[PDB]
Amino acid sequence: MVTSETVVTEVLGHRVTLPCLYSSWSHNSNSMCWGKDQCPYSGCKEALIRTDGMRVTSRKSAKYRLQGTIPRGDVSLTILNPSESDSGVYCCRIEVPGWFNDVKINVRLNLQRA
Amino acid sequence: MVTSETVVTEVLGHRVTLPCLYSSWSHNSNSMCWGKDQCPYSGCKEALIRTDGMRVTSRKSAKYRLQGTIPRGDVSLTILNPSESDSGVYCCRIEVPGWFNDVKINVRLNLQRA
Amino acid sequence: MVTSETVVTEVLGHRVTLPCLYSSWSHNSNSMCWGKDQCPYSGCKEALIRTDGMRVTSRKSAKYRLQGTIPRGDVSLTILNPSESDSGVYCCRIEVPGWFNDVKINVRLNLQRA
Amino acid sequence: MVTSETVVTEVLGHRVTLPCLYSSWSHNSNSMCWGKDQCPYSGCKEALIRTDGMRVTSRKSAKYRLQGTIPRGDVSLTILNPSESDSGVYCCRIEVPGWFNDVKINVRLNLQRA
Amino acid sequence: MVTSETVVTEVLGHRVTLPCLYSSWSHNSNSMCWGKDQCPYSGCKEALIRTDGMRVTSRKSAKYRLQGTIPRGDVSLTILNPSESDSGVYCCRIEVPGWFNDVKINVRLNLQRA
Amino acid sequence: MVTSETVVTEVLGHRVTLPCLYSSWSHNSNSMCWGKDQCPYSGCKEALIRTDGMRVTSRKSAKYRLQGTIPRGDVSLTILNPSESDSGVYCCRIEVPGWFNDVKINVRLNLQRA
Amino acid sequence: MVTSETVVTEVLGHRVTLPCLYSSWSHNSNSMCWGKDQCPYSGCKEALIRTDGMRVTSRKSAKYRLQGTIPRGDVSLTILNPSESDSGVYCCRIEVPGWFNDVKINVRLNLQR
Amino acid sequence: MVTSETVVTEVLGHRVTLPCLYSSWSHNSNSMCWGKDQCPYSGCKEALIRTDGMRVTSRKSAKYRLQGTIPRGDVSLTILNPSESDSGVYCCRIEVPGWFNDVKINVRLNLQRA
Incomplete structure (x- = not known):
């Protein structure tokens, strides 16, 4: 099957x-x-x-952060002080009421040296 | 920098x-x-x-083939007898005349056994 | 889950x-x-x-026919002398090579009196 | 004549x-x-x-609820304790000032078992 | 009720x-x-x-002409030797098979002097 | 030259x-x-x-009224107690700072009996 | 007044x-x-x-050529041997029958060293 | 390489x-x-x-002003009493965190004589 995903190419x-x-x-x-x-x-x-719809409900993490405005749907993931092991595919699951209405959006992280 | 890519999820x-x-x-x-x-x-x-503007110019490879119609712009890559090592990111470079007009189109391949 | 479909309203x-x-x-x-x-x-x-990609491979119906150009992808269903039992949802399945690549298209037929 | 409608496929x-x-x-x-x-x-x-411009003014049954924020135009229909007989076509009529300006929006509900 | 139309502002x-x-x-x-x-x-x-599907079938007119390519759907109206009385609203009726499938597209002509 | 306009078809x-x-x-x-x-x-x-950007500043005639929310850009015209002579072409001019930035929006009114 | 134009950034x-x-x-x-x-x-x-609608009707020029397929509307301009003086705004005028129907398309050329 | 830009035509x-x-x-x-x-x-x-994301941080210029609401992203440039030397190409650079995420937006100013 063919789908699509975002690619983030970044520096350490x-x-x-x-x-x-x-x-x-x-x-x-x-x-x-x-x-x-x-x-x-x-x-x-x-x-x-x-999150619950307003804010992060997850216990506070040293690595993972949501710094966008969550009530407007900006649930972008911030990964603090990344290493090469952080590279790979990530999945953002938006929960939607009802049967099979959830939205899955994929982002591939590619970390390289400057 | 953020770009996008097609994901092909397929079976061996x-x-x-x-x-x-x-x-x-x-x-x-x-x-x-x-x-x-x-x-x-x-x-x-x-x-x-x-390819050039008409046809495949590199060898005749048992693994790699273009079965689409190249003069109409269908330069899709076909991979014969794929194995798990064939999974990963592929890049399709369209050469366009002039300075920095080339188009780069990315496809990530994921092979499963089923 | 939420989808969309065409509605065809015609006379019996x-x-x-x-x-x-x-x-x-x-x-x-x-x-x-x-x-x-x-x-x-x-x-x-x-x-x-x-069909097979060229033609109807099914026997023959007095009722059902594909009158469009099948090799150009017009696989629209024609229903001869439709009656009230012919009202309802129809589903057009396009078979596409590979894993979960098939396309499903819904059309609802609504037949009226005079 | 051909129109379009949304399809809601849900579970009991x-x-x-x-x-x-x-x-x-x-x-x-x-x-x-x-x-x-x-x-x-x-x-x-x-x-x-x-409804009027603000809220529900009458319902035929407690089964039917308008839970969206109505003054912003979310007049989506909620059906409580749905059964198989609730399947079928529903029509949402928006009343607009003037001559023949009303908007009719159709939704087909499909309830499944299992 | 609100629809739209094309306006042709022209010269005699x-x-x-x-x-x-x-x-x-x-x-x-x-x-x-x-x-x-x-x-x-x-x-x-x-x-x-x-017209029919190919060409003009009404008697040849000194005033009215279809000079576009009709089999491709260019059924634009040409008006020869226009005068002020030719100003006003025109309606182009596309006849389509089936029940109430005809399309009406309206054009208002405003003719000016010199 | 070809432009477009809205047509309002209404009743007296x-x-x-x-x-x-x-x-x-x-x-x-x-x-x-x-x-x-x-x-x-x-x-x-x-x-x-x-209007001056907030409210009507001149010629609330009798006939003519602006009842929409002007600060939000709804400058739609209301014509009270209309008669046949009110049919015809209207032009809404939005004044914008700078050189030749004004916007012209046309509406043709067609009034029918009742 | 505000309009738009395409920008071509190229090399000598x-x-x-x-x-x-x-x-x-x-x-x-x-x-x-x-x-x-x-x-x-x-x-x-x-x-x-x-052009006339089929092909170029103006004298054949050493600098200016139309290399696209003109009957399909590809009237893109080719400039041979460009120099910095060729930089600036160019205007493509498509002639259309009738009153004030002509289309004007602007392209700015920016040549670098 | 081909991009696009806005053109502003004004009077000196x-x-x-x-x-x-x-x-x-x-x-x-x-x-x-x-x-x-x-x-x-x-x-x-x-x-x-x-700017720093809130307001202009460059020392105050007699010529250059940012009069839109900067926190909502309107960083449009106002040029006071422009003279003929002010004509030409301008570039608006939006700085974005991470690698090569900056957005470059071009405007050409065309000043005409009174």
């Missing part, structure tokens, strides 16, 4: 950001989580980071 | 194709080549496969 | 056509079948009507 | 929602109603549910 | 053209006619000018 | 509205006026009705 | 091309000419170069 | 604004500067004028 030494925007976001209905390699399953249990 | 044992289309194609002006991991450098010289 | 007894177009069609690789209520499963068995 | 046992959005909505000018199979006539009486 | 003294293009045109199914003030009724009888 | 006996929306409107920079047959000249002098 | 030493496409082109009705700084006046006389 | 002696809008602007992340003929380099340390 500063935090990097993986874009995920869901413009129609509403704090009343939506929530979100990030996973590596694969999308977290429905109900966002086993994720890198997670 | 049959030929797979990585889509690459250049609608504006004209045989007198355009040319093309394919590369793995990275785009070949300007002048498409050490690539997986290469 | 008049031949009707349910639109289904696949612009990218190739006589070498594509095929198709139509189903009522649900799309036929892959391999288009037990269908209203079916 | 939980409330389902049928989208109907009118962005230009104003509590001063607009009102709305929902009907089954056919759109309610002008003046939105004999309906499943109906 | 040379033939003028009112655009009407129907890209989907096919000589096997489509035909057309022009009317002044209103589109002619279905079946395009007592019209300014009329 | 009730107020009618002619649409003119300018979304980028700002009370600090924009103003507007309506004219019959032609847009009023630059400076909107002797128009049907005119 | 090879012929350069300024795009101008009119998809709707038909040889019976359309014709075309190019001008520098400003559009040539109606009646494409004179331009750097001009 | 009148203040002009050169549009530059960046919708995604955030006071936390973005900064900007304007240059003539060419974009200022990364880090905007010469330029015509510059």
Whole structure:
């Protein structure tokens, strides 16, 4: 099957950001989580980071951060002080009410030397 | 910098194709080549496969084939008897006349066993 | 899950056509079948009507016909002398080579009286 | 004649929602109603549910709910405890000032078992 | 009710053209006619000018001409030796098979002196 | 030369509205006026009705009213107690700072009996 | 007043091309000419170069050539042996039958050292 | 390489604004500067004028002004009493965190005589 994904090509030494925007976001209905390699399953249990529709509900992490305006659907992932092992495919799962309405948006991180 | 790429998720044992289309194609002006991991450098010289404006000019490779119609801009890469080592990023470079007009189109291949 | 479909509103007894177009069609690789209520499963068995990429390979219906240019991807369904039992949802399944590449297109037929 | 409609494919046992959005909505000018199979006539009486510019003013049953933010034009229909008989075509009628300006928006609900 | 129309602002003294293009045109199914003030009724009888799928079938007119390529759907109206009385609203009726599939496209002509 | 316009087809006996929306409107920079047959000249002098960017500043005639939200760019014209002589072409002129930046928006009104 | 134009940033030493496409082109009705700084006046006389709707009708020039397929509306301008003085705004005037129907398309050429 | 730019045509002696809008602007992340003929380099340390994401941080110029709301991304340039030497190409550089994410936006100013 053929799908599409975003590619972020970056340099080591500063935090990097993986874009995920869901413009129609509403704090009343939506929530979100990030996973590596694969999308977290429905109900966002086993994720890198997670939100409720307003803010991060995940325990505070040294690595993972959401620095965008979450109530407007800017759930972009910030990865602090990245290393080469952080390279690879990430999945942003937007939770949508109802049956099989979730949106999965993929971002590939490619870290290289300046 | 952020770009985008096509993802092809496929199964082993049959030929797979990585889509690459250049609608504006004209045989007198355009040319093309394919590369793995990275785009070949300007002048498409050490690539997986290469064409002029009409046809494949590099050898006759058992693994790599272009089965689409090149003069109409269908330069999709076909890979015969693919194995797991064939997974990864491929790059399709459309050569366009002039200064920095070349088009680079990326496709990530993911092969599963099923 | 949320999708979309075309609705064809016609009068009982008049031949009707349910639109289904696949612009990218190739006589070498594509095929198709139509189903009522649900799309036929892959391999288009037990269908209203079916093709190979050139022509209808199904026997012949007094009712069902493909009158468009099948090798150019116009696999629109024509229904002769439709009756009230012919109202309802139809599904046009385009068979595409590879893993989960098939396209499903829905058309709802609504027949009226006078 | 050919029109288009959205299809909502859902599972039994939980409330389902049928989208109907009118962005230009104003509590001063607009009102709305929902009907089954056919759109309610002008003046939105004999309906499943109906509003003024702000809120629901009458419903045929507690089964039907408008839970979106209505003054912003989200008059999407929620159906509580849906059963198989709830499947079929629904029509959302937006009332607009002037002569023949009403908007009719159709949604087909498909409830599945298993 | 609100619709839209094209406006042609022109000068007297040379033939003028009112655009009407129907890209989907096919000589096997489509035909057309022009009317002044209103589109002619279905079946395009007592019209300014009329065609079948290929060509003008109404008597040759000293005033009205179709100079575009009709089999490709260019059924734009040419008006020879225009005078001020030629100003006003025109309607281009595309005849399409089936129930209420005809398309009406309106053009208002405003002719000026010199 | 070819342009386009909105057509409002309405009935006598009730107020009618002619649409003119300018979304980028700002009370600090924009103003507007309506004219019959032609847009009023630059400076909107002797128009049907005119505003200063916030509200109508001249010629709320009797007939002519602006009931939309002017600061949000809804400068749609309401004509109270319309008669047949009110049919015809109207022009909405949006005044914009700088050289020849004004926008002209045309609406043709067609009034029918009742 | 605010309009738009395409920008061609190129390098010296090879012929350069300024795009101008009119998809709707038909040889019976359309014709075309190019001008520098400003559009040539109606009646494409004179331009750097001009056509009749099929092919170039102006004298054959050493500097200016139209290498696209003109009957399909590819009236892009090719400039042979460009120098810095060739930089600036160019205007492609597509002639269309009737009153004030002509299309003007602007391209700015920027040549670098 | 081929890009596009906005053209502003104004009359000498009148203040002009050169549009530059960046919708995604955030006071936390973005900064900007304007240059003539060419974009200022990364880090905007010469330029015509510059901001820190909230306001102009370059010392006040008699010529150059940013009068739009900078925190919403309107970094349009206002030039007071422009003279003939002010004609020409301008470049608006939006600075974005990470590697090669800066956006370059061009405006050509054309000043005409009174």
